[PDB]
Design a binder for this molecule. Structure first.
Ligand SMILES: O=C(O)CNC(=O)c1nc(Cl)c2ccccc2c1O
Ligand SMILES: O=C(O)CNC(=O)c1nc(Cl)c2ccccc2c1O
Ligand SMILES: O=C(O)CNC(=O)c1nc(Cl)c2ccccc2c1O
Ligand SMILES: [Mn+2]
Ligand SMILES: [Mn+2]
Ligand SMILES: [Mn+2]
Lengths: 229, 229, 229
């Protein structure tokens, strides 16, 4: 956990060396309290005004009134009314990555996703062990920003547990307010979200490597590079 | 087989309870004869003016003049010249689904496909056993409208056979004129089209669940949620 | 290796019979020297001005300064400044295919990709054995144009080796200047690029079959045939 808006020093003296050594980097106090609170207010307002999905279907029985649903999501561009501070976070994330370019592995980052805002509703659901990009879709770095004030995992659960490749250990990350996490999106970092027993919010952006994305366009072929005659 | 343009009673008293109990619902006389005949005329005109593909490649030998092809398709938005009544069918299907919303399982339907018009040419080809959505691409309900007047499966074949999960039985559906079929698109309903020995037309729309579709955008990643820096 | 801008005779007397018999067709002197040299100049200028990716990641060790990268690519529409002659090549390829239509197997070609320009940097990397379209994504014909003057595979490597299905033999194709290659994109033609020890350029376009592409839209579902309610 390194310590932070100014961040070139953070990128060059902490994020780049940490990513190249461990593949997992945690920055605490990324935006500061005023800004982090504004983002949390925007995300709660999206939740309270019904902009999230109903949640991943976790258990489906004969009676659909008992169906259990987990993580809820919404995709945010950063330009929508009421999402301007999420947009500021995304710009901040983008400036950090730009300052790392050419220094994160041998990747050359040239694109990203929209922001994926996730809400674990606090009903004991988590997210199963997975790899974000197991099949070469172009995503090289996962970046998550957490929004949960005074989170106490001893009673609320919700820890991100990463299983770094080749090492016999876990890396456990609490989803703390104003924490920014980076990790390699491929099979080097399988991970899971342990059951959350309180409402838990996070915002994820994935960053794309230019070479991997260019050749993915053949595999994930759409109309895309398909055109008329 | 329930019985039908007015249809809120049909949705609430038949379609919703049948889908939640059996996963497979058949509505006969959905649009009535005048309208059903107009749709059939539009589809035959698309066929006769060459708008369908040449058909699924079924057998490919050394000599391509003998290649066997099966089902032919065309994708219809519903706004094209000469497709206005298909467009009316799609609007009718959409109004029905809207009246079911929140009541079909725990799904929240927020999108659909264009209409897939299919023609089995009558040369003994059918469609192999499959699941429509086996990998979580967002499609929750399959809706098929049939256009075949006086169909007699005893001589023309072409029955849809569904293999509902967990039950040791078949559900056999004849592709009858003005019949509308609903079934869950996932692995609950593997199905096949038995060999058709007469020209057989159907129109399919798939309906998307909001949560499943939102998270599919990560799996089926395109430029999509991918954007520039 | 048949012999060539005029080419209807080439399509009808050589390409069509060769593709239907062998699945692999080589045309030498396709555009002639003046035009081929102009294309090579355009491709080298894209390389020299940094328009290619950094190359397929081949070896990734703990230290990313030693990472080995292979083939570099760029996607070209044919209308960009400085790509007009690539655009002429693409138009030439498209006119040839149009003159074959209905005669290549039972396919009906109705679309293509943008041009994929590839550069093997000459560092001993090649491309592993693969099939271009193994899963039914609509691509029926692969068309490659080579740009390498006085290529000598005895010292530079870089041969395309195809492993035609059912036959116990290789088909070895040198990546010669102004050579145009056609082959079926599916599992009939697994192939590899043997290690290249000099800079090696090629331009690939894939051609889509109408039926296979229409039904791929269901499998590779995007927002695509997905639309709002
Ligand atoms: O929230 C966290 O600490 C870690 N979360 C994830 O790893 C995560 N990963 C994916 Cl791929 C999805 C994908 C969809 C919805 C939520 C996700 C999620 O929370
Ligand atoms: O027509 C029928 O009763 C049932 N047909 C299908 O189940 C069906 N399913 C798919 Cl996924 C396709 C897909 C492509 C073309 C035709 C299809 C078809 O008829
Ligand atoms: O260059 C050649 O002779 C043959 N090359 C290929 O077969 C080839 N195939 C694919 Cl699918 C890719 C795909 C991405 C980049 C380069 C490729 C390549 O050179
Ligand atoms: Mn993840
Ligand atoms: Mn089906
Ligand atoms: Mn290839």
């Amino acid at each position: 956990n390194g310590q932070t808006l100014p961040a070139l020093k953070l990128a060059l003296e902490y994020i780049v060396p940490c990513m190249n050594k461990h593949g997992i980097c945690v920055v605490d106090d990324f935006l500061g309290k005023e800004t982090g609170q504004q983002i949390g207010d925007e995300v709660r307002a999206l939740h309270d005004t019904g902009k999230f999905t109903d949640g991943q279907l976790v258990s489906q029985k004969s009676d659909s009134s008992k169906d259990i649903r987990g993580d809820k999501i919404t995709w945010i561009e950063g330009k929508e009314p009421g999402c301007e501070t999420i947009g500021l976070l995304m710009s901040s994330m983008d400036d950090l990555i730009r300052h790392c370019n050419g220094k994160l592995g041998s990747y050359k980052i040239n694109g990203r996703t929209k922001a994926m805002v996730a809400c674990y509703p606090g009903n004991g659901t988590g997210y199963v062990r997975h790899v974000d990009n197991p099949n070469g879709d172009g995503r090289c770095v996962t970046c998550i920003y957490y929004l949960n004030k005074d989170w106490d995992a001893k009673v609320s659960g919700g820890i991100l547990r990463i299983f770094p490749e080749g090492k016999a250990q876990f890396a456990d990350i609490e989803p703390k307010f104003d924490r920014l996490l980076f990790f390699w999106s491929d099979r080097r970092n399988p991970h899971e979200v342990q059951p959350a027993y309180a409402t838990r919010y996070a915002i994820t952006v994935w960053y794309f490597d230019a070479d991997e994305t260019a050749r993915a366009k053949v595999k994930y072929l759409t109309g895309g590079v398909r055109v008329e005659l």
